Amino acid sequence: YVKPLPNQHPYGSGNDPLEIQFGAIFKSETKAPSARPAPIGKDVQRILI
Amino acid sequence: MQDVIGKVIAEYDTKGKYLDAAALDLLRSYFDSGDLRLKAAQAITANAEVIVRAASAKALHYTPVTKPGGNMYYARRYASCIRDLDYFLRYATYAMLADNTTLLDEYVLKGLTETYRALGVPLDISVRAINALKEVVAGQVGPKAGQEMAKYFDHLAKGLG
Amino acid sequence: PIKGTSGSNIARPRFYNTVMVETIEGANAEERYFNPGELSSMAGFFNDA
Amino acid sequence: TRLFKVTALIPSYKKVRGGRELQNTYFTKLVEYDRWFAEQQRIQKQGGKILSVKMVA
Amino acid sequence: MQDAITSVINTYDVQGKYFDTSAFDKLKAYYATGELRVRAAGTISANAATIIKEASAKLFSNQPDLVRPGGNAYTTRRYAACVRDMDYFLRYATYAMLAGDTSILDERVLNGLKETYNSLGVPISSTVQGIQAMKEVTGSLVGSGAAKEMGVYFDYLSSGLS
Amino acid sequence: MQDAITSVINTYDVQGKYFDTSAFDKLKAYYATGELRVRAAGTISANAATIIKEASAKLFSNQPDLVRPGGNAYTTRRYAACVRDMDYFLRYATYAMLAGDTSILDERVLNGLKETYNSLGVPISSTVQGIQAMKEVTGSLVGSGAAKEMGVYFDYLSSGLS
Amino acid sequence: MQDAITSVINTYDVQGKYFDTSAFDKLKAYYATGELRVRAAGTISANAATIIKEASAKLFSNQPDLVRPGGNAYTTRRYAACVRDMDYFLRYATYAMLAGDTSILDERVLNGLKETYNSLGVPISSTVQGIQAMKEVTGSLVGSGAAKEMGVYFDYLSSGLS
Amino acid sequence: MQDAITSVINTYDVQGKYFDTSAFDKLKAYYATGELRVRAAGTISANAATIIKEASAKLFSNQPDLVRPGGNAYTTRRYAACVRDMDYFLRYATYAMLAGDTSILDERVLNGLKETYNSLGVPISSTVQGIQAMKEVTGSLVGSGAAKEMGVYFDYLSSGLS
Amino acid sequence: MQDAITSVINTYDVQGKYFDTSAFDKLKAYYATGELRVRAAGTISANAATIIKEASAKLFSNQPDLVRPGGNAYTTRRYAACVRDMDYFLRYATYAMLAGDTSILDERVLNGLKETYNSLGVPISSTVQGIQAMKEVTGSLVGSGAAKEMGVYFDYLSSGLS
Amino acid sequence: MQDAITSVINTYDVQGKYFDTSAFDKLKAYYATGELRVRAAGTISANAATIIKEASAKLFSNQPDLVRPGGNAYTTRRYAACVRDMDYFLRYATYAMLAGDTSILDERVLNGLKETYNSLGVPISSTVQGIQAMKEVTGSLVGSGAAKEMGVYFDYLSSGLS
Amino acid sequence: SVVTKAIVSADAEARYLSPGELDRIRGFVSSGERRLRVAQTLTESRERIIKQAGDQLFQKRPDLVSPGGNAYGAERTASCLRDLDYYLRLVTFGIVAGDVTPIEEIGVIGVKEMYRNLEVPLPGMVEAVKAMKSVATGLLSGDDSAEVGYYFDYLAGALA
Amino acid sequence: SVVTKAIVSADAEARYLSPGELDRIRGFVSSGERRLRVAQTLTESRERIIKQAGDQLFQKRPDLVSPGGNAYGAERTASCLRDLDYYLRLVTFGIVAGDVTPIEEIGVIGVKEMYRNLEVPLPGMVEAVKAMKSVATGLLSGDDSAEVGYYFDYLAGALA
Numbered sequence A: 001y002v003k004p005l006p007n008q009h010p011y012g013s014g015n016d017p018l019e020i021q022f023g024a025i026f027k028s029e030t031k032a033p034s035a036r037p038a039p040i041g042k043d044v045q046r047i048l049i
Numbered sequence B: 001m002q003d004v005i006g007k008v009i010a011e012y013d014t015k016g017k018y019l020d021a022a023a024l025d026l027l028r029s030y031f032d033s034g035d036l037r038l039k040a041a042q043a044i045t046a047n048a049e050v051i052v053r054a055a056s057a058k059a060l061h062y063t064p065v066t067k068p069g070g071n072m073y074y075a076r077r078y079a080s081c082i083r084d085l086d087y088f089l090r091y092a093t094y095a096m097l098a099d100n101t102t103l104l105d106e107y108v109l110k111g112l113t114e115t116y117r118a119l120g121v122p123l124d125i126s127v128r129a130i131n132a133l134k135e136v137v138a139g140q141v142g143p144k145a146g147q148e149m150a151k152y153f154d155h156l157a158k159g160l161g
Numbered sequence C: 001p002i003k004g005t006s007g008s009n010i011a012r013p014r015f016y017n018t019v020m021v022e023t024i025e026g027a028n029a030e031e032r033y034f035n036p037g038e039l040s041s042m043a044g045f046f047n048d049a
Numbered sequence D: 001t002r003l004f005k006v007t008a009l010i011p012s013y014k015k016v017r018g019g020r021e022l023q024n025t026y027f028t029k030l031v032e033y034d035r036w037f038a039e040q041q042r043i044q045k046q047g048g049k050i051l052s053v054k055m056v057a
Numbered sequence E, F, G, H, I, J: 001m002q003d004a005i006t007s008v009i010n011t012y013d014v015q016g017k018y019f020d021t022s023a024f025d026k027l028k029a030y031y032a033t034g035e036l037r038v039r040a041a042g043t044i045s046a047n048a049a050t051i052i053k054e055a056s057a058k059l060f061s062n063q064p065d066l067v068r069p070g071g072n073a074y075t076t077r078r079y080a081a082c083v084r085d086m087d088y089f090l091r092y093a094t095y096a097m098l099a100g101d102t103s104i105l106d107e108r109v110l111n112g113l114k115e116t117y118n119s120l121g122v123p124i125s126s127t128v129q130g131i132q133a134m135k136e137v138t139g140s141l142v143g144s145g146a147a148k149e150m151g152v153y154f155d156y157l158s159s160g161l162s
Numbered sequence K, L: 001s002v003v004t005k006a007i008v009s010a011d012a013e014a015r016y017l018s019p020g021e022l023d024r025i026r027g028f029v030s031s032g033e034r035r036l037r038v039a040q041t042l043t044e045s046r047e048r049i050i051k052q053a054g055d056q057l058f059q060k061r062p063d064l065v066s067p068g069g070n071a072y073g074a075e076r077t078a079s080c081l082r083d084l085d086y087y088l089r090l091v092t093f094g095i096v097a098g099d100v101t102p103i104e105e106i107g108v109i110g111v112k113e114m115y116r117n118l119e120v121p122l123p124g125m126v127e128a129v130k131a132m133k134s135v136a137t138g139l140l141s142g143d144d145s146a147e148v149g150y151y152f153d154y155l156a157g158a159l160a
């Protein structure tokens, strides 16, 4: 509530895959909720390295 | 807490035999009187505020207890007295439906006298208020149910007194 | 703007009480089944309905 | 120094309560020694009166 | 929660108009099965442990892997939890039958059920099979007419799981 | 994804077991329901635009705040997004109904939808209301027998969102 | 929450600096307006129930569907809840005006409010209209400068809900 | 728990009468002593640690058996309990000083302390001696005027525990 | 990204109301300050490289360990990345000042910046110090009023990082 | 939670003296008896349920009036309390035997027990008879060497009750 | 009884008895004559019900009468008849009370430990009370049997 | 009062009074003489305030003295005037104490329950208190009138 938006996919942290060589591993809402929604707007530009 | 049914079951359990004819007669005397008890309970439920208001008025309003120096003199203290009268009415209705005074003795009179002594509540004025509530309830519910409810109000009065 | 969001559920406000809802929730609050009194009351309710 | 048997009456000054709260006002509990200082302080801050305390064990 | 009565009352309150023919038909249908549903509820409330016994026996006979080592029901604790969940399902199905509405199921079973079973590793298909076995046992116990009324909510739970 | 046939096959493959009488019973059940499923799928494909039409109109009539200024569906962009989401819901419910399994719904729709909607600010109660709108709109078009089948998948979507 | 003094203190503490000329100028500016803020707060506490009455009347006149069947204010329960929400908004806007900062608003009102109403079904736009109505009602009672200052915080509330 | 002002308010309220001129004179007395009371309170707040230092030192000097084995102060826990008691006595004495009334002492110090010490076996005489030790040194720091005025509260504590 | 004009447009579109006198007043105020904003932006653009040079010189003089071995700006690569980040901050502060709204900072600069720097290892406090040095350098070039204007955006960035 | 080892430390600490040869000898005595204390405790815990069986059977055979209606033990609840009391007596006797001190009995069983039993109508002499029946079976099982040690605790409880 | 449960529920919420609880009590008192008549109907045939229940119990579980069983021996039969008598009495008390509570306190709270001490298997209890259920439901009318069966198989379920 | 609240706040977290609490106590005692002067003026002319407020209230709300109203009758009107006298005395008490704690503790906590028991219309309270406030602020100077009217304002809000 008191900090800027996180470095996150605009549709939630579960939409970000692990940056591994292969596999497409995502967090699941159901196996362990661990879900953080962020009010990321349409003009938010992510900071990439 | 127990009702007449629980009381007779407890007695015949301690004595260890089945329910005989006399137990049946007491149970029927409770059951056939049930409709009157529910009529009285519904009448009190609908008009509880009016009963407590009339009783508090006639018993307390222009007596010295409301004036400064009395136990009832505050908005909080007056509201607390009306709240206690609500307690008495509701629990007398509960006891009347249960047809037993052990509920009145336990839920209401357990440590109440010590609390009233420590707080400074006058017991005699409480007895007067409970009595006035008794006649108000009798007037609203009719003589038949009023006689039954008078037993529980008198139990409350002797508990405080 | 809001920096963060907690999420939105679907609230169930209680508008009023029904006899059937009252009996069922009385059973459920104690995490139990229906006693003969509740069964008789529900039967009488369906009779007077 | 094991236990205290405490009887106290905490009245209500902030509002009027519709529920019973009779046993909440006038009560006797057994309080552990390590907890009696904090419990006595709480009763005192609440405005209640500690009627008497005895030593149990 | 809601029942059939609350649903109709709200449906006609949001419109702001009295009960029409369809409303009275819904209420008459709900009231007609009321005594049958209350009889079935009394039977289930009286004989819940029995129904759990045959339901669990059928489930663990059809799928013995559950109670053998390496199965999700292999321990005393996990077996007790399994039969406890089955009791939950039976009781809430009884609640839904008496209410006539599946709102209580959505509110107090399905809300968080999938998260729980996917976190704990509980096999959802086997739970559906156990619910079906419970349906069969309770239908055999309470009669076909009440069996259908039990089965509609048992199917609601099964479809919620799978 | 997974359908009823593949579900039975995978269960017996993980057990290393052979198709027994129960497996063939389940396969017979699916083959029996197949023609109804195919007819319903074709009907829903024919009327998909109509179903979205009516469900959107009814949802925005029951809750007109969405389309008035300040609503989540108030703009051409956000209204078109609502219609696009409803078209997904219809198409994927049809897929699940034709398959006889809700695994496709889970993996393609429900895995990540709550967090997407919570991050977007999308109301989830209203989305469930829109799903129920599609449910009882398509129930009339497919018929009672096919409605009873598609309803479980619509309720699965609703329970996944709720 | 934080006020103007605390805001300046935080800004200078995160930089590890003492108060410069600009800091003392800003603090003096806040101190100069303190008596006006106290008088405005007393005036609002004088007529809070009044302001709620006119604001609700204006809102329900311009939004009559709110109190008709299907509207979210159509109940005495829902009417009381709406006017209590209006009480919340007025009280916290007065707190913000007295503090001189919009932090208390964001912390205790705006955070989580849109999702709360989305769960409850409350129309955000109608609430914004009610807040604006409260703004015109309060401005006349408080006078010109107090109205500018007090409407800054009403605009903050409306924008946060918007 | 009441100061001088609330005490006179109570004694005039119970009679049901308005304030008389004698009440106003009593009030002027406390208002005229207020600045001295606040100055003494600030001094005591600054020097509380030192007062505890020297008070414990003098108490354990005059009575050596208390710190030695077999004494009612011989333990690290019991030593800490004694110093905590003295600190609380000092703080509440300063509280009664600021309030101008001993009601706070009855309501927050002597409330249950007498019988607590009686059950525990704490010697009354040693406690009174410790109160005297704190008072006669605190009066030196606070000044003679504030010394005489803490005298009433300290010997009130002594007489109450006596 | 939204400027003052866009903010007014959105706060009136959410209400659904047309423009009235207050909106025209806010727009007029923005056009009143527009000339100052354009002159400040042109001056900053004309001297961006100079501003970065004194700001980085001041930061590395105040914290020499940054550019020495073992500091996060010890490499031609990391030094270049550092002055690149400083150019980011100056350019986006100029954007925000020219728009009159801090939205672009939250929208394109401060989002995920803390996580990015913490993953890189960049000292947050030293970046804030660089921003403050850049503020001091920019103020002298832009003059008193334009410095007061740019200061709110520089302080916004510093508070967002810290 | 008093022990002989704890008791000697408490005594030397209250009288403020170091270890003596008497404490040396008694600590050797406790340590040497410790192994037989261990075996006695293990044997009793082995047969605690059987001991309670035999004691209850003997008590109910001697005086059946308790189990028959009108007796203090005529209820499944009251029978539960009956056997629970014997189990507690056995367990705390074993605790005292392991401790080597009877203070644990005084602290957790005997104090207030007579008054509680009189208030609840529990017969004291019947409980003493039960304790005697318990001690005879315990002494038979453990053997004379441990029987002598267990005898003193059972006698102490019997004397305290009487 | 039903009245006590309703009063406790009302006191929990600090409110008067609801009309649902009120007409629960109304149905309870209106059904009093039938319940008392049922309680008597159980009473005359006490010896018949108990002996037939014991016979069916031996038939269903020979293990109790088999060698090595807890009920093996002639002396155990005197206690068996008397205990079945207690449980029938508790069933009648519950019938007149209108709920399962008197049965609960008198014979259910602590029955598990009571038969753990006496090494009595719970299945023996459930089969015996099922036998009493069958005998009584055979004796009573269908409408009365429906009401009494609840108490009987509640005792069965509580025993296990 | 002010010092009472400061002491309660300090004792809540078990510390000596904060410097800010000491400053607020100094501000309270420094203005004590002006508070006592306000007490002079309000106490001396109590009859003017009470009677003028009663007249203004009755004119504003004629239904109160009309038959069927709560204030109808000589005794009920006397009780009205006595209630106004009580609230004036409490307002003076709060003026002296520097906080509204006397008003609240004496006649605000539970005021709604009591006036529900008396059927007293709370808008009657509000209008009577507003009339009292008007008279009191008129008889005082502006600097005193604002501070005094704050207490009447709090009382009216509590009743409303």
Ligand SMILES: CCC1=C(C)/C(=C/C2=NC(=C\c3[nH]c(/C=C4\NC(=O)[C@H](C)[C@H]4CC)c(C)c3CCC(=O)O)/C(CCC(=O)O)=C2C)NC1=O
Pocket: A020, A021, A022, A023, A024
């Ligand atoms: C280069 C770094 C890297 C690694 C190592 C890696 C592991 C990896 N192993 C996978 C599958 C797998 N990996 C294994 C191997 C394990 N299971 C068996 O039991 C063995 C005990 C054990 C190997 C000794 C198996 C059986 C699967 C199939 C699981 C599945 O597809 O669901 C997958 C899923 C994607 C795919 O199969 O295409 C990944 C991502 N990913 C990476 O980016």
Ligand SMILES: CCC1=C(C)/C(=C/C2=NC(=C\c3[nH]c(/C=C4\NC(=O)[C@H](C)[C@H]4CC)c(C)c3CCC(=O)O)/C(CCC(=O)O)=C2C)NC1=O
Pocket: B065, B071, B072, B076, B077, B078, B080, B081, B082, B084, B085, B087, B107, B108, B112, B115, B119, B121, B122, B123, B125, B126, B129, D011, D012, D013, D015, D016, D017, D019, D020, D021, D022, D023, D025
């Ligand atoms: C349900 C059973 C029950 C009872 C009976 C009961 C009595 C009761 N009355 C109380 C206060 C009070 N009770 C009264 C009423 C008294 N003064 C009047 O003059 C009368 C003579 C008399 C009543 C007829 C008053 C004035 C107080 C406030 C006393 C004080 O706080 O100083 C309190 C202290 C808690 C509180 O103030 O809320 C209790 C516990 N509480 C219960 O839970």
Ligand SMILES: CCC1=C(C)/C(=C/C2=NC(=C\c3[nH]c(/C=C4\NC(=O)[C@H](C)[C@H]4CC)c(C)c3CCC(=O)O)/C(CCC(=O)O)=C2C)NC1=O
Pocket: E066, E072, E073, E077, E078, E079, E081, E082, E083, E085, E086, E088, E089, E092, E108, E109, E113, E116, E120, E122, E123, E124, E126, E127, E130, E131
């Ligand atoms: C009414 C609302 C409700 C539901 C639905 C519910 C389900 C539920 N079941 C649980 C445990 C469990 N549930 C099961 C289910 C069984 N596993 C077998 O394989 C079967 C397939 C299946 C039943 C037929 C198992 C094995 C556990 C224990 C898992 C573990 O703890 O490791 C738990 C974890 C908490 C606990 O252990 O007490 C929950 C929350 N709880 C609720 O309050």
Ligand SMILES: CCC1=C(C)/C(=C/C2=NC(=C\c3[nH]c(/C=C4\NC(=O)[C@H](C)[C@H]4CC)c(C)c3CCC(=O)O)/C(CCC(=O)O)=C2C)NC1=O
Pocket: F057, F060, F061, F064, F067, F073, F074, F075, F076, F079
């Ligand atoms: C601010 C951006 C925006 C716009 C523009 C917008 C348009 C819009 N037009 C609608 C219906 C409509 N729109 C029209 C207008 C058409 N009729 C004729 O064919 C003409 C060619 C044409 C007008 C010139 C009509 C007749 C309807 C009613 C259709 C229906 O009720 O089914 C609706 C549905 C109203 C509801 O569900 O309550 C919306 C939201 N919505 C927005 O958020």
Ligand SMILES: CCC1=C(C)/C(=C/C2=NC(=C\c3[nH]c(/C=C4\NC(=O)[C@H](C)[C@H]4CC)c(C)c3CCC(=O)O)/C(CCC(=O)O)=C2C)NC1=O
Pocket: G060, G067, G074, G075, G076, G077, G079
């Ligand atoms: C059954 C449940 C229920 C009822 C009846 C109800 C009545 C109700 N009528 C209202 C409006 C109104 N109602 C009335 C008067 C009417 N009111 C009636 O009691 C009289 C027969 C009649 C005049 C003689 C008026 C004049 C208004 C306009 C708003 C106002 O009074 O200021 C309002 C305020 C909301 C609005 O502005 O529309 C309510 C809550 N609320 C409920 O939840």
Ligand SMILES: CCC1=C(C)/C(=C/C2=NC(=C\c3[nH]c(/C=C4\NC(=O)[C@H](C)[C@H]4CC)c(C)c3CCC(=O)O)/C(CCC(=O)O)=C2C)NC1=O
Pocket: D001, D033, D034, D035, D036, D037, D040, D041, D044, H072, H073, H078, H079, H081, H082, H083, H084, H085, H086, H088, H089, H108, H109, H110, H111, H113, H116, H120, H122, H123, H126, H127, H130
């Ligand atoms: C705020 C009012 C207040 C106070 C001060 C208070 C003190 C207090 N002192 C206690 C024990 C004690 N009190 C003391 C202090 C006394 N013994 C000697 O040293 C001195 C003569 C004398 C100090 C002047 C000691 C040493 C103990 C521990 C002795 C023991 O373990 O029995 C206890 C028992 C609970 C515990 O210590 O955890 C309390 C509650 N309680 C209150 O409600």
Ligand SMILES: CCC1=C(C)/C(=C/C2=NC(=C\c3[nH]c(/C=C4\NC(=O)[C@H](C)[C@H]4CC)c(C)c3CCC(=O)O)/C(CCC(=O)O)=C2C)NC1=O
Pocket: I060, I067, I068, I073, I074, I075, I076, I079
């Ligand atoms: C390991 C990679 C690396 C390099 C190469 C590096 C160079 C470097 N040289 C610097 C200063 C400097 N460097 C020079 C060197 C120039 N003077 C003449 O013109 C020559 C053409 C030329 C040298 C042959 C001078 C004069 C300064 C002082 C600049 C000033 O303080 O104004 C600085 C500024 C910070 C400091 O003074 O410590 C850096 C970062 N830093 C690094 O981390």
Ligand SMILES: CCC1=C(C)/C(=C/C2=NC(=C\c3[nH]c(/C=C4\NC(=O)[C@H](C)[C@H]4CC)c(C)c3CCC(=O)O)/C(CCC(=O)O)=C2C)NC1=O
Pocket: J066, J072, J073, J077, J078, J079, J081, J082, J083, J085, J086, J088, J108, J109, J113, J116, J120, J122, J123, J126, J127, J130
């Ligand atoms: C810390 C160790 C401990 C002790 C010593 C203890 C004694 C004890 N016995 C109790 C009741 C009881 N105790 C007994 C057992 C006695 N009556 C029978 O006739 C026998 C002769 C005899 C057993 C040898 C019975 C029958 C009751 C039930 C009385 C009642 O229902 O009120 C109770 C009250 C619990 C209740 O009534 O539910 C206590 C506290 N409890 C403890 O936790």
Ligand SMILES: CCC1=C(C)/C(=C/C2=NC(=C\c3[nH]c(/C=C4\NC(=O)[C@H](C)[C@H]4CC)c(C)c3CCC(=O)O)/C(CCC(=O)O)=C2C)NC1=O
Pocket: J060, J067, J068, J073, J074, J075, J076, J079, K057, K064, K070, K071, K075, K076, K077, K078, K079, K080, K083, K086, K087, K106, K107, K118, K119, K120, K121, K124, K125
């Ligand atoms: C109303 C509450 C209540 C109950 C229920 C009760 C039962 C009870 N049955 C007992 C004996 C017994 N009762 C039985 C009978 C049963 N055990 C066997 O496992 C069979 C499964 C079954 C007979 C077929 C037996 C075998 C005994 C042990 C010796 C004997 O026969 O007396 C005893 C021990 C002393 C005595 O004979 O009175 C009790 C307390 N007592 C009560 O106060």
Ligand SMILES: CCC1=C(C)/C(=C/C2=NC(=C\c3[nH]c(/C=C4\NC(=O)[C@H](C)[C@H]4CC)c(C)c3CCC(=O)O)/C(CCC(=O)O)=C2C)NC1=O
Pocket: B057, B060, B061, B062, B063, B066, B067, B072, B073, B074, B075, B078, L057, L064, L069, L070, L071, L072, L075, L076, L077, L079, L080, L081, L083, L084, L086, L087, L106, L107, L114, L118, L120, L121, L123, L124, L125, L128
């Ligand atoms: C200091 C704290 C305190 C207050 C405030 C208080 C108010 C109070 N006013 C009362 C009567 C009354 N009070 C009023 C006045 C109201 N009715 C009219 O409608 C007007 C709108 C309004 C006056 C402005 C009236 C008319 C009565 C007579 C009601 C009756 O006796 O039945 C009573 C009933 C007992 C008695 O009169 O002796 C109380 C307790 N009591 C307290 O201890």
